[PDB]
Amino acid sequence: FKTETLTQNCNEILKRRRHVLVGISPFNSRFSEDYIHRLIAWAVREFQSVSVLLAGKEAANLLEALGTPHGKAERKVRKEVSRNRRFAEKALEAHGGNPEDIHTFSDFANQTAYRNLRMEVEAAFFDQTHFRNACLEMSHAAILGVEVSADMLELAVEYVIAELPFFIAAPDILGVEETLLAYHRPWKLGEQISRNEFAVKMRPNQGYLMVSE
């Protein structure tokens, strides 16, 4: 795997190798069982600690926006997420990692740190048109992994708002000293956040690490 980071700060966290948060998306062809194992093997080799982030319940929004009825969408997600979990558990066992350090971005709905970060992201979303547009686009890119209408995006964007706290301050939520969220797509919104373009800030102990094989 190769790596690319946003700022020079994301780079400094990278050199310490303390912790990596490996994103696994429920509906993205990237994540074959096989790829999950290779990805996880690499993480455990490269980092002192490895955790895994799966999609929360808002992933149901992506399917609903795409037309799936609510009840079915919720079950489809449960099926896909629990499947991602099973592969990641297996992979973590096999490489010495920790099968319990797998979380979904819904697992902290009642946690102070997570809720506070939701509030910050939400505030910015409603107050700042440029941040709201950025979020809509990021939600559009989530669907792509038929025309995508305005209203499909307002449904889908709940998904983006729910995950973003782990993109800006996962350490607050997970209780680790510092982290890199690791993923195979580039993070456009992350660049703008870097340049202080929004009321939402990237914590100095969070980085984004783009991986590629």
Ligand SMILES: O=S(=O)(O)CC(O)CNC1CCCCC1
């Ligand atoms: O829009 S992107 O595809 O760049 C990013 C996105 O929306 C979701 N990516 C996953 C979701 C599940 C947990 C880890 C991150």
